[PDB]
Amino acid sequence: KLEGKVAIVTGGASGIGETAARIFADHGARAVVIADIQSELGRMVAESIGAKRCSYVQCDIADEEQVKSAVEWTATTYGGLDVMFCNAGIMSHSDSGQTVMELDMSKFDEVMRVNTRGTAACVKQAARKMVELGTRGGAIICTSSPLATRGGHVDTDYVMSKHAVLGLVRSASMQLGAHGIRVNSVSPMAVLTPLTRRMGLATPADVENALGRFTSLKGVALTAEHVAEAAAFLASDEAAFITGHDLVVDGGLLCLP
Amino acid sequence: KKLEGKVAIVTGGASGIGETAARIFADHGARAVVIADIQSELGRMVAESIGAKRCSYVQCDIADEEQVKSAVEWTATTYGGLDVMFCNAGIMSHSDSGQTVMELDMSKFDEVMRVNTRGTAACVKQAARKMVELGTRGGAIICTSSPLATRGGHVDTDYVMSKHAVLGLVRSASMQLGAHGIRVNSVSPMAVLTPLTRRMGLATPADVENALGRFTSLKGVALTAEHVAEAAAFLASDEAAFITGHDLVVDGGLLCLP
Amino acid sequence: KKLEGKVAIVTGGASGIGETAARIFADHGARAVVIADIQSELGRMVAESIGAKRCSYVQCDIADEEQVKSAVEWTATTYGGLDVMFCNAGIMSHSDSGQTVMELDMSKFDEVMRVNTRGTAACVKQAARKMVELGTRGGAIICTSSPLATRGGHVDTDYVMSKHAVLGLVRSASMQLGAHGIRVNSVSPMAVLTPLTRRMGLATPADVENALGRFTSLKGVALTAEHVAEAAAFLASDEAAFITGHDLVVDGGLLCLP
Amino acid sequence: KKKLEGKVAIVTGGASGIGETAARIFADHGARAVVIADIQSELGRMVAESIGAKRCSYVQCDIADEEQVKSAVEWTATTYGGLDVMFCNAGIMSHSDSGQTVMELDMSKFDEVMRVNTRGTAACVKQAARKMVELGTRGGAIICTSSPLATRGGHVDTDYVMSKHAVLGLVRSASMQLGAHGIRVNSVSPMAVLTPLTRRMGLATPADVENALGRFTSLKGVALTAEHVAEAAAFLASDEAAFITGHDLVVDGGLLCLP
Ligand SMILES: NC(=O)c1ccc[n+]([C@@H]2O[C@H](COP(=O)([O-])OP(=O)(O)OC[C@H]3O[C@@H](n4cnc5c(N)ncnc54)[C@H](O)[C@@H]3O)[C@@H](O)[C@H]2O)c1
Ligand SMILES: NC(=O)c1ccc[n+]([C@@H]2O[C@H](COP(=O)([O-])OP(=O)(O)OC[C@H]3O[C@@H](n4cnc5c(N)ncnc54)[C@H](O)[C@@H]3O)[C@@H](O)[C@H]2O)c1
Ligand SMILES: NC(=O)c1ccc[n+]([C@@H]2O[C@H](COP(=O)([O-])OP(=O)(O)OC[C@H]3O[C@@H](n4cnc5c(N)ncnc54)[C@H](O)[C@@H]3O)[C@@H](O)[C@H]2O)c1
Ligand SMILES: NC(=O)c1ccc[n+]([C@@H]2O[C@H](COP(=O)([O-])OP(=O)(O)OC[C@H]3O[C@@H](n4cnc5c(N)ncnc54)[C@H](O)[C@@H]3O)[C@@H](O)[C@H]2O)c1
């Protein structure tokens, strides 16, 4: 699917991004660059994938200059840039849950900084590099959420940030189609990662107990591989005419708990 | 191979998008692909070309629920299962006034609604019932939709209403059949060169670009039946094991209808 | 007064939401309200109660396009105008197996689709033709829809499909009739205590609260037919002069269907 | 009865444009008191004096400063004895030669647009809700001004598009969380209203609007006015909308696509 492509995975040191980097390489990616802020964790992932197929770059995506450097380093080292997986994202793990009435505006600022400013800087810098290189069939994919299209009972800062990511995806797909660049998102429900266990979901039983009643599809558990497979489809020529689309991977979510 | 060992029915498989999907499903390793359709000899030609040991042709007017029952049951006992139902058959009216609201021909409305909604509903029902009987694991039902399932049209109002209805069927069936591990999704392509769009006036890739090009964000690629079949194959495979109730839009970033 | 001097037709006005809309339209100053229904005894009682100088009954099965045309003609001729068409009549199956996909009764599907999609389309068409013919300024066409026009259902799959189709009609009619200054919108209420919901087993406010209370964000108020009528009167008035193609949802923040 | 009889309303950004007209229309619909919160002191006191000092007051309030929002909300509730309507209407767009396209996104201008439109709006919803809960307000209403660009992408002003998407996420979440208190939260999404903001974008006259947007607008024979937007807001703020929450009320004349 991805033979000969060069991909960057922000947040690739952990969770969904880690699995996505592994799966992109299994799909024949020429090179996968993990861009994260967890240097030793990230280097670990890179060697696990294979030090000759995967590299790590320290990159705080909220700092546009660090994004530009990571993008430039990637294109120079590997001679191209075909896939930007804008995946890094954070939540506030606030004791009072970031409800509207208890909204911690300082914690709100942190979430919006990473999830909207960082994602926007990543889309911008990746687009600029693909255009400069004349990349053909380039793909930019943002990790979203069902909370990009419906409200939350908690984590209001996160909900607003993912709504904003969807607006960015829609706008970028409109503006970058002229260059043949496709911009899409993938919105998974609950994946066991370090993020979801900070919310109190550590085991598949925790997931089913929290969400199963609200999930239409029975008899299958959502894995990080599932999310990576959706993203590899979007990045591949199997999706050559798909842009501006939010690919939802949620088992028919009826509502949040 | 993503469809290895699966048994697929493709309605409307004698022509256009359905024909390509049947070929592409077989190329992705489907054990058997059954074309259900009403163009008897165009369809036998296709199953012939795909490989008479991989592909059969069944006469099936999808509006008739007993013919859908029969086609589904024939497929399952012949090949020992049913894993994928690609509910793709569908029509438009091709009317002098264009089926604007002002000039809606109620009789032609009835014909479009009969195939596109009653027939699609019959296929989803009969395919689902058989999957549950056989105990199919990870079954997939996929309906061909349209950007006109989520937006209004300037013309072909009956077709627009029918595709809106198909989307409601997909959403409802996903919530009801998830208990059986059956996933239900749709694929919504924009303009594919088929006999249907030829009846509309689009014969050549240059016609498509002249009618839809300025309304499409993505430049440098034309949509093909293969693209739609690849979207469906993805949805039918384990690559989409947790995707249900979803409308997979393949429109190049359609800004608006012309 | 919001609707001062306007002539309105309310289909399904003999009962439930339509009856309350007819009364509320008159309270907002409508010059004439015409109730179009198939329950003549009930409908004549509503018309007489609103006021025989202000309100008339016409027998009209909206699934028969000729009866619709006749009712619209009679309204414009009797009252010299047509400003508001509230296409509100609709039905459900009330089947013992709930019209799930697995147990979908196609003949009952046909009945629901006939009233809710074919009939609604004929009403939109015939009202639009008449307002265009009269030169109506700022005419309004409103269809009663449902949260099930935008999400799937666990039951009543035929009704879900039909209300999706109604939204496709509203969107299409909005884009085609705006050239004439005609606005087309829908209103989508959740559970109102009417003969329709009584037939689904909801007879009392406690029944509604038990079925839907914990799926509804908004507490302290129960949806009434008057709430729905006020939404329709807003959309029908100059308070909504630039609103078209819109589905006005009146559901209390519905988290999910039961 | 007047649609807003007896209600106390706050209108942020009420010194100008849509918010000024909303303040006038709310008073016209019988609001007991309208408080204009803005950062244009002389303009805002003009509006308040014009509506009538007995029924309208002005407060200086930078909505991106949560403390000033809380202070304006407390002053309203203490002065007038209640808080029934919060119309979170203040917002900005960037001054950008490059249009804030993705390719030329000025990140520091993006920051400012997000700070006012998302951080400020969130603070306004929070502080208004906290007060209505404290007061035991019955049938309270919080309305945010949104845009078609809350639900569709834009060719330009990408920062603004993301900010309005985020506002809709706030409206949806607040609706879900505040319904327990009887508080309804909705948005109103107008297309092109002639204001100082759209003049800055190059739309100064009705002909400008028609030339830029007429062929993309289904509804003919009428042009969107600020009064139309205010009437939609007044509806949502009233008992005519007693069961409407979490809803985006679109006022765009059937917009077929963005320019
Ligand atoms: N896990 C879920 O269930 C779930 C569901 C829906 C959406 N998501 C989203 O998927 C993305 C990945 O989430 P995850 O579950 O793998 O969480 P995770 O915490 O396991 O991984 C996130 C990684 O992003 C990195 N990160 C944080 N800030 C960064 C920054 N400024 N610059 C660069 N990297 C940064 C982190 O170091 C981390 O390695 C996130 O956008 C999340 O919002 C997750
Ligand atoms: N061509 C496009 O650009 C386009 C765009 C959007 C959606 N679609 C939809 O994709 C589906 C296939 O369209 P197509 O372009 O391949 O058109 P097509 O006419 O070339 O193929 C349709 C086939 O379905 C068969 N058919 C019609 N009624 C039938 C019935 N009752 N029972 C069984 N078969 C019946 C027809 O014989 C035909 O072989 C349709 O549902 C169409 O609405 C097509
Ligand atoms: N909770 C609710 O009541 C609810 C919720 C959502 C949507 N709706 C929709 O609101 C509309 C009215 O529903 P209601 O609850 O008032 O039901 P109701 O049964 O109380 O009233 C419906 C009236 O429509 C008339 N009707 C049926 N078929 C007709 C036909 N062919 N021609 C003319 N009239 C016909 C009926 O005789 C009846 O008087 C319907 O479209 C319904 O789908 C109702
Ligand atoms: N005019 C349009 O076409 C249009 C369309 C859709 C949405 N909107 C939105 O409507 C809102 C009002 O826009 P408008 O056209 O009336 O513009 P406007 O500039 O005429 O009025 C906005 C007023 O908000 C005040 N404002 C800005 N930042 C503020 C802050 N931090 N604190 C307090 N007040 C502040 C401003 O001084 C100004 O008086 C905005 O949210 C805009 O996004 C406008």
Residue numbers in the entry:
A (entry chain D): 24 to 280
B (entry chain C), C (entry chain B): 23 to 280
D (entry chain A): 22 to 280
Show passages lifted from the paper:
1 is then reduced by the enzyme iridoid synthase (ISY), which generates a reactive intermediate 8-oxocitronellyl enol 2 that is primed to cyclize to form the canonical nepetalactol 3 scaffold, the precursor to all iridoids in plants. The stereochemistry of the bridgehead carbons (C4a and C7a) are set during the subsequent cyclization of 8-oxocitronellyl enol 2, the ISY product, to form 3. Some NEPS, although containing an NAD+ binding site, are redox inactive and catalyze only cyclization, others catalyze only the oxidation from nepetalactol to nepetalactone, while others are dual-function enzymes, catalyzing both stereo-selective cyclization and oxidation of various nepetalactols to nepetalactones. Here, we set out to understand and expand the selectivity of NEPS by both gene discovery in Nepeta sibirica and enzyme engineering of NEPS from various Nepeta species: N. sibirica, N. cataria and N. mussinii.
We identified, characterized and subjected to crystallography analysis the NEPS orthologue NsNEPS2 as a 7S-cis-trans nepetalactone 4a synthase. Biochemical assays showed that NsNEPS2 (N. sibirica) is a cis-trans cyclase and oxidase; when NsNEPS2 is incubated with 8-oxogeranial 1 and 7S-ISY, 7S-cis-trans nepetalactone 4a, with no presence of iridodial 5 byproducts, is observed. Since NEPS belong to the NAD+-dependent short chain dehydrogenase family, mutation of the active site tyrosine residue required for oxidation in this class of enzymes could be a straightforward way to decouple cyclization and oxidative activity. Mutation of the active site tyrosine in NsNEPS2 (NsNEPS2-Y167F) yielded an enzyme that produces only 7S-cis-trans nepetalactol 3a, with no iridodial 5 byproducts, suggesting that cyclization activity was maintained while oxidation activity was eliminated. NsNEPS2, 7S-cis-trans nepetalactone 4a synthase when assayed with 7S-ISY, yielded 7R-cis-trans nepetalactone 4a’ when assayed with 7R-ISY. Correspondingly, NsNEPS2-Y167F yielded 7R-cis-trans nepetalactol 3a’. In summary, the active site of NsNEPS2 can accommodate formation of both enantiomers, 7R-cis-trans 4a and 7S-cis-trans 4a’ which have two unique 4a-7a bridge configurations (4aR,7aS vs. 4aS,7aR, respectively). NsNEPS2 is able to catalyze cyclization of enantiomers yielding cis-trans stereochemistry for both 7 S and 7 R ISY. Enzyme assays with 8-oxogeranial and NsISY show that NsNEPS1A, NsNEPS1B, NsNEPS2 and NsNEPSL all oxidize 7S-cis-trans nepetalactol 3a to 7S-cis-trans nepetalactone 4a. Based on the available NEPS crystal structures (NmNEPS3 and NsNEPS2), we hypothesized that the relatively bulky L199 residue in NmNEPS4 prevents the orientation of the 3c relative to the NAD+ cofactor required for oxidation.
